């Protein structure tokens, strides 16, 4: 649903469902290693060693997963 | 009853607000705040930091890092 | 009139009460002044009697000298 | 016309009409000293010592005029 | 389907032609890879067989090894 | 015939494009390019830099600095 974010929504939903570990590079140069708990259009909820991280997507540069998502 | 595509954001910040959970807020410029959520809209967050008020624009916010986890659904 | 009531109210109180505030930019640069006006994208600041038009996308935080009610 | 940019459009139009010199601080830390030739919603056209500068507004931090605009 | 025909066509050619490209981020950081997919906000890159989901707001420029027609 | 609020931008980049005027393009990260406009839409610019193609996102662009001034109206 909602066009122009089919890749984005699918990919983050795969990361979350598959519990794939990923490095999330922020545009400020900081980085987090975690699993996707949830997302909406503007934010992602992360688990980093049992603590919760709410990351704004405008702050995100890259997702780097441990293993690839099936397309 | 929600504006689509911001249900996670709105709920989480509201949970942070209602529970008055202390959080470290990392800004995109590398600055950081330790405080509690007083209010929010679509574009800004109002923080309580040691009894002083900080109005933070969400575009400048990178991460919310809470002291206690928020209950989801 | 939008989903922006917190921001509009707060900047409006800062203006009306003439509260002095430090405005930290995403630059890491900062301005210390009073708000004269704003719309959705900009704020007009008074800094030692001189006018500064700051874009809101460039702004990080408003830090007021005294709290807004 | 066009609500929520009454301050912005008026102020930049005053700078342009009045030919007031201003320092334009960019969010990258660079700065230009010039006069407003034109603007739309996303850009400003600047004159800096006789040469033209097209500045994107998303790149602009602050306008600092030599003299104040009448409100 | 928008005002975004240049961008959509170009990334689509890069993908179809399998052109290797350097992707410079607003970070000053860079990625060297191939485009697997994109939507309006993200691009999927192949970097040495590993997947990188890069947000378009984080991207500065695409620099292709060979020109697109 | 124009999309409101981008008449200056669209005209100027099109003039730069039609005249093939050489320009220095300063990016927000401090990087810079010297080239000519091949194409643009709302979100990107295509550059010719010494015969090589550069697709620049407009959000990463700070300034266009032209070699020759563009004729306005």
Q: Which of E61, E63, E65, E66 to mutate to test the interface with F (most CBs of F within 10 A)?
A: E61
Burial pattern D44-55, b for ≥16 Cβ within 10 A else e, equals bbbbeeeebbbb
Phi, psi of A50 (to 5 degrees): 90, 0
- CB contact (8 A) between residue D5 and residue C57: no
- The chains found to touch A (3+ Cβ pairs under 8 angstroms) are B, E
**Do at least 3 CB pairs under 8 Å connect E with F?**
yes
Burial pattern C28-43, b for ≥16 Cβ within 10 A else e, equals ebebebebbbbbbbbb
Q: Hey, what are B3's tokens?
A: 């504006």
- CB contact (8 A) between residue B26 and residue A30: yes
What 3 state SS string does D26-41 have? ECCCCEEEEEEEEECC
Is the CB of residue A39 less than 8 Å away from at least one CB of chain B? yes
* Cα of E13 to nearest chain F Cα, Å: 12
Say which of F7, F64, F69 has its CB closest to residue D40: F7
Q: What is the resolution of this structure in A?
A: 2.8
Is the CB of residue B46 less than 8 Å away from at least one CB of chain A? no
**F68-73 long-range CB contacts below 8 Å, 24 or more apart?**
F68/F19, F68/F21, F69/D51, F69/D52, F70/D52, F70/F12, F70/F15, F70/F16, F70/F19, F70/F21, F71/F15, F72/D37, F72/D38, F72/D45
- CB contact (8 A) between residue B60 and residue C59: yes
The CATH number of F1-73 is 2.30.30.100
Please, is C18 exposed, middle or buried when counting C-beta atoms within 10 Å of its C-beta (0-12, 13-18, 19+)? exposed
**CATH of region D1-71, choose from 2.30.30.100, 3.50.50.60, 3.40.50.150, 3.40.1160.10:** 2.30.30.100
Q: After which residues is chain D broken (C to N over 2.5 A)?
A: none
- CB contact (8 A) between residue B66 and residue A56: no
Residue D42: helix, strand or coil by DSSP?
coil
Query: D19: left (phi > 0), else alpha (psi -120 to 50), else beta?
Result: left
Contacts of C30 by beta carbon, 8 Å cutoff, 6+ apart: C22, C23, C24
Domain boundaries, chain F: 1-73
The answer to whether A46 and A55 are in contact (CB under 8 A) is yes
d(CA D55, CA D31): 11
**F23-27 long-range CB contacts below 8 Å, 24 or more apart?**
F23/F64, F23/F65, F23/F66, F23/F67, F24/F64, F24/F65, F25/F56, F25/F61, F25/F63, F25/F64, F25/F65, F26/D28, F26/D30, F26/F61, F26/F62, F26/F63, F26/F65, F27/E26, F27/E60, F27/E61, F27/F56, F27/F60, F27/F61, F27/F62
* Cα of C43 to nearest chain B Cα, Å: 13
The answer to whether E68 and F47 are in contact (CB under 8 A) is no
Is the CB of residue C44 less than 8 Å away from at least one CB of chain B? no
Closest CA to B8 of C60, A53, E55: A53
Say which of D8, D62, D68 has its CB closest to residue C41: D8
Query: A10: left (phi > 0), else alpha (psi -120 to 50), else beta?
Result: alpha
Give me the count of residues in chain E.
69
Q: Is the dihedral of CA C9, C11, C12, C13 positive or negative?
A: positive
- CB contact (8 A) between residue B31 and residue C10: no
* Cα of A71 to nearest chain B Cα, Å: 23
Is the CB of residue D13 less than 8 Å away from at least one CB of chain F? no
Enumerate the β-bridge partners of residue F37. F47
Nearest CA in chain F to D27: F28
What is the fold of C1-69?
Answer: SH3 type barrels. (2.30.30)
């Amino acid at each position: 649903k909602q066009g122009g974010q089919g890749l984005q929504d699918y990919y983050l939903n795969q990361l979350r469902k598959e519990k794939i570990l990923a490095t999330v590079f922020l545009t400020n140069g900081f980085q987090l290693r975690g699993r996707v708990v949830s997302f909406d259009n503007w934010t992602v909820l992360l688990d980093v060693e049992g603590k919760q991280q709410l990351v704004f997507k405008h702050a995100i540069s890259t997702f780097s997963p441990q293993k690839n998502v099936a397309l």
